[PDB]
Amino acid sequence: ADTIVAVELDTYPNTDIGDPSYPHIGIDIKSVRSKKTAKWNMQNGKVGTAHIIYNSVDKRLSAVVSYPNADSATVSYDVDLDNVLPEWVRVGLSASTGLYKETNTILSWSFTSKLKSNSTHETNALHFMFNQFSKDQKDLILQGDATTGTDGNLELTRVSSNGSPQGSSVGRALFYAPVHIWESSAVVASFEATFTFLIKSPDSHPADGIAFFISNIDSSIPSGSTGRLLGLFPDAN
Amino acid sequence: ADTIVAVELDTYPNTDIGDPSYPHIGIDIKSVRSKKTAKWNMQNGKVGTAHIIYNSVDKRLSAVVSYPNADSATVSYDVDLDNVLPEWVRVGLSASTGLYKETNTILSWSFTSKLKSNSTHETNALHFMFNQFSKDQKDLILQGDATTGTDGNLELTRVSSNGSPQGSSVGRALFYAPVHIWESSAVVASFEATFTFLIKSPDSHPADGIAFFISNIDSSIPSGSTGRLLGLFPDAN
Amino acid sequence: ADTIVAVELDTYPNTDIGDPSYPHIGIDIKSVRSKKTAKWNMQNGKVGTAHIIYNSVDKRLSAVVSYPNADSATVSYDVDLDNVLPEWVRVGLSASTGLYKETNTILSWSFTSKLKSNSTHETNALHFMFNQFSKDQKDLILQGDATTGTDGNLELTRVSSNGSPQGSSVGRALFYAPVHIWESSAVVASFEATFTFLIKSPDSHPADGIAFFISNIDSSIPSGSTGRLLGLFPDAN
Amino acid sequence: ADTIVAVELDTYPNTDIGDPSYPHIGIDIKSVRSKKTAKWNMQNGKVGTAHIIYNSVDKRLSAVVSYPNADSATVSYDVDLDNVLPEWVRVGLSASTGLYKETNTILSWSFTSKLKSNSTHETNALHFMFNQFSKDQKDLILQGDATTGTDGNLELTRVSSNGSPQGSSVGRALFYAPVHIWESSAVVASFEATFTFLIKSPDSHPADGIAFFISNIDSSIPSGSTGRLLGLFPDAN
Ligand SMILES: [Ca+2]
Ligand SMILES: [Ca+2]
Ligand SMILES: [Ca+2]
Ligand SMILES: [Ca+2]
Ligand SMILES: [Ca+2]
Ligand SMILES: [Ca+2]
Ligand SMILES: [Ca+2]
Ligand SMILES: [Ca+2]
């Protein structure tokens, strides 16, 4: 049903569905089998940052993930999103846990979308920046187990009172207003997203990951999308 | 019902309800009887620009209206919006015509809302910029007679095919996502809005005006709000 | 000689020159005797944030200083900077120590200056953001004892190798490009500055303070401006 | 001497030095012989817009030129600017005329430069926007025949009183503050430039072109760089 384009931060290697033998970042185009991946030296307990960029001139969706005092991981993929996604979309964050677990804490999230026309000084733009999430965040659509306000953070997956991450959990957060990614007169369309996250787990093999995604406006969590499916895909096809 | 705060560009003087004997700009706080006004040298057929600013430190809502090659009109009013508006609001543009008419064309509209916390580097923000409106503008809620797409413009009030403005019309456009104007930890909240408009009428006494407003999220056009009520207030009390 | 407008974070009370009997924030207009002050609950060793705003409509220069988990201090002063400062200025940060000392560490510094004309869509702007200072920061003019690069920070005053603040020190940092604060066709001019700082001292009565200032482009540190004069004024008149 | 990277809007085809047989846009890397070009349907007398983008992840310098109501021209080139340009540079606009002439009027110019570190929330940025140039633009370095203020525009090349473009002219405008395009801890560096221009000539074969360029900070107009050399290169090698 849903049309998904996502940049996944996959913490658990499911070699059976294509994942390499280590934590990695990937670019999914309508499938959990990333069309491109890169080795990601994930750090349990540290706060990392993910930057995602794209422009209609280059037609290259790229993402860079980093941790303070460490080398970053980068992954690019040539794709024309006008040929994949509809005109109006909704952007969001998703995460899941399965038998193995982890906290999927989002500490901040910014996003910028620009459509420049052939007309003189004619730019349309949308930009949001969340550095503090409140208990009643009305400009966010929360699905599944996602909640706001706990320490001013976004918890994508269920976390108990003592701070322990629960398993078999799945949650997503989408910005309220639909975003316009294509125009008829647009000479250049672009977008950039940034978000800091904290993945913490008492386990040695944490699972499953966090993903920034772009889907159709009426997108909802597919049934049985916990675990390796990251709350984005209905199956591993 | 609705809580309204608005900056009106009133083209028709209704001396009976408090309006001075000339076109003017005013600041309305829950009443059509502006709590403050300034003489506005309106120009039929020219494109003007309105800038609206406010910050929680100064607690002063100010607006400046200008036309190219002309002196501007300015009006300020000391008001603490935390004591007037709820935490979550929706911003928008409204216009109306009555026996006398005019076109209420919006050529562009930008808005910025910032909430800075006492935390280090903790800003929440929302910013939108419409320089080109399309026929299916999904991130706008259109009410009454407002329509998009005609020449890439927003027509707040009904306009016929030949370009002639209709009377007894009323329309509003609100940004889709609710805006957060107050926090508990906020040390400074601010917002600024800018919009260009074209008021054209074949009449010598055009009516009624355009208004940028901020209301509760479920705000709708009150019954019989055409004419002097600007599509904002149910009565002239 | 120099024309100075400054927002001072005064840590040492010099009751003899007008300072109240406690640490405070003040607004100086060509004199060290603040034309307006507010009690500031300074915290030794904590990182604080100062926000400074001004717009030509309100003609009110305001500043808010805060620390995480604490109430903020605010101070405003009605002043028309067009009547005080020249058309072109340079913005900067200054600090000093005297018999009593403190570190005057600047961890970040952003600044935005806007001039909006009566012309349609005619904004001139300058915006810089320093979150990391390098050893050779070419877009900054360093005067006195100010240095960059140490831990990616700006040290306005001299600090020894072991991290200890030296006395009788004075340093300033100015952005390289002159800023334009007034136009002939401007309908609204505004600026906002933000900077995080760390004041640390082994003493119980730290001195002297940090100040964000705006002066004429060829401004230099006046002789004997260490101590209470904050590196801004030649005398206490 | 000078290290130049430029995006040229070449109006006159000098087939002898590599230029195709028509007006075109090109990307020059230390040579007037563009390493990549695209057909440009130049329009005498119309105002066009040029957008230039680049990011250190993609390592692709792209430019899109357009006119209202027309299809745009685009050209990309894979190049790592860290391997071509020094750490600190100056950005600018240049133009020239020779036997054949044209006006090289710049109506607006914006530029954004960002350096994001691996540190949490650590962005350095510079952004300037000129929509109105004044007679004494202190934040611009003008070289050759470039002048400001005439109708609030930047005239890169000499124009007489009656509005007629002169030949054998050459002028450049550089932003005052040096820009930082590379860091040691940077995970992503990017920049985008936009400028509107008006090329008008009474001739059927106008010459020579306008170029947005990035060079070393002490860059000056090379001798005999009028005509086909665009005020950027000393020779056509
Ligand atoms: Ca996996
Ligand atoms: Ca994977
Ligand atoms: Ca009226
Ligand atoms: Ca009125
Ligand atoms: Ca003092
Ligand atoms: Ca003082
Ligand atoms: Ca040529
Ligand atoms: Ca060429």
Identify the CATH number of the domain in which residue A107 sits.
Answer: 2.60.120.200
CA neighbours closer than 13 Å in the CB half-sphere of residue B187: 29
B78 is annotated as contributing to ligand binding: no
Q: Nearest C-alpha of chain C: how many angstroms from D66?
A: 19
C-alpha C122/C-alpha C118 separation (Å) is 7
Residue C118 to residue B55, Cβ atoms within 8 A: no
Phi, psi torsion values for B210, nearest 5 degrees: -125, 145
The number of beta carbons lying within 10 Å of the beta carbon of residue A45 is 9
Give ∠ CA D50-D51-D57 in degrees, rounded to 5. 150
Rounded to the nearest angstrom, the gap between the alpha carbon of residue B154 and the centroid of all alpha carbons in its chain is 13
C-alpha A181/C-alpha A178 separation (Å) is 10
C-alpha A135/C-alpha A150 separation (Å) is 7
Which-ligand-closest: CA of A205?
A: 1
Q: To which H or E segment does residue A78 belong?
A: strand A73-78
C-alpha D200/C-alpha D47 separation (Å) is 9
Which residues make beta-bridge pairs with C143?
C172
- Would you report the helix, strand and coil content of chain D in percent, each value rounded to 5? 5, 45, 50
Q: How far is the CA of C233 from the centre of ligand 5 (A)?
A: 12
Residues by chain with Cβ below 5 Å of ion ligand 1: A 10, 12, 14, 19, 228
Best A111, A128, A187 residue to mutate vs chain B (most B CBs within 10 Å): A128
User: Which 3 state secondary structure label does DSSP give A150?
Assistant: helix
Residue D177 to residue C125, Cβ atoms within 8 A: no
**Considering only CB atoms, which chain A residues are within 8 Å of D64?**
57, 187-188
Count of H helices and E strands in chain B? Answer: 0, 16
Q: How many domains does chain C have?
A: 1
Question: Which chain A residue lies closest to B114 (C-alpha atoms)?
Answer: A129
Structure tokens at D67: 């006119």
The DSSP 8-state label assigned to residue D63 in this structure reads: E
Q: How far is the CA of B36 from the centre of ligand 1 (A)?
A: 61
Burial zone of C221 (CB within 10 Å; 0-12 exposed, 13-18 middle, 19+ buried): buried
C-alpha D133/C-alpha D136 separation (Å) is 8
Give ∠ CA A131-A134-A135 in degrees, rounded to 5. 155
Give ∠ CA B210-B212-B218 in degrees, rounded to 5. 115
DSSP string, D112-167: EEEEEESSTT-EEEEEEEESS--TT-TTEEEEET-EE-GGG-EESS-B-TTSPBPS
Q: Tell me which residue range forms the domain holding D3.
A: 1-237
The number of beta carbons lying within 10 Å of the beta carbon of residue A81 is 18
- The resolution, in angstroms to one decimal, equals 2.2
Of B148, B164, B146, which Cα lies nearest the Cα of B156? B146
C-alpha D196/C-alpha D68 separation (Å) is 11
Of D114, B29, B144, D18, which Cα lies nearest the Cα of A192? D114
Q: To which H or E segment does residue C126 belong?
A: strand C123-130
C-alpha D145/C-alpha D95 separation (Å) is 10
Q: Nearest C-alpha of chain A: how many angstroms from D162?
A: 26
> Which residues does A161 contact at the CB level (< 8 Å), separation at least 6?
none
Phi, psi torsion values for D164, nearest 5 degrees: -80, 130
Q: To which H or E segment does residue A227 belong?
A: none
In chain C, after which residues does the backbone break, taking C–N over 2.5 angstroms as a break? none
The number of beta carbons lying within 10 Å of the beta carbon of residue D218 is 9
Could you give the dihedral angle defined by the CA atoms of residues B198, B175, C122 and D116, in that order, rounded to the nearest 10 degrees? -170
Contacting D with CB below 8 Å, chain C residues are 88, 117, 119, 121-132, 134, 136, 138-139, 152, 175-180, 183-185, 217
Question: Which chain B residue lies closest to A176 (C-alpha atoms)?
Answer: B177
Which-ligand-closest: CA of B34?
A: 4
C-alpha D180/C-alpha D91 separation (Å) is 10
User: Which 3 state secondary structure label does DSSP give C187?
Assistant: strand
User: Which 3 state secondary structure label does DSSP give C21?
Assistant: coil
User: Which 3 state secondary structure label does DSSP give C27?
Assistant: strand
Cβ B208 vs Cβ B10: under 8 Å: yes
D12 is annotated as contributing to ligand binding: yes
- For residue D141, CA distances in Å to A17, C34, C126, D144 come to 58, 37, 16, 10
Structure tokens at C91: 């913005």
Please identify which residue in the block is written with the tokens 């910050």: B55
In chain D, after which residues does the backbone break, taking C–N over 2.5 angstroms as a break? none
**Considering only CB atoms, which chain B residues are within 8 Å of A129?**
123-125
Structure tokens at C211: 């100040």
DSSP string, B100-126: S----EEEEEEEEEEEEESSTT-EEEE
Cβ C170 vs Cβ C154: under 8 Å: no
C-alpha A145/C-alpha A154 separation (Å) is 11
Of C234, C223, C232, C235, which Cα lies nearest the Cα of C27? C232
- For residue D19, CA distances in Å to C161, D96, D224 come to 59, 16, 19
- For residue D61, CA distances in Å to A24, B174, C179, D18, D193 come to 28, 38, 30, 20, 11
Phi, psi torsion values for C205, nearest 5 degrees: -125, 70
Which residues make beta-bridge pairs with A140?
A175
Whether the CA torsion A69, A75, A80, A85 is positive or negative: it is negative
Could you give the dihedral angle defined by the CA atoms of residues C23, C25, C30 and C35, in that order, rounded to the nearest 10 degrees? -90
Please identify which residue in the block is written with the tokens 């003592």: A162
Of D88, D113, D92, which Cα lies nearest the Cα of D104? D92
**Considering only CB atoms, which chain A residues are within 8 Å of B123?**
129, 131
Could you give the dihedral angle defined by the CA atoms of residues B109, B112, B113 and B114, in that order, rounded to the nearest 10 degrees? 180
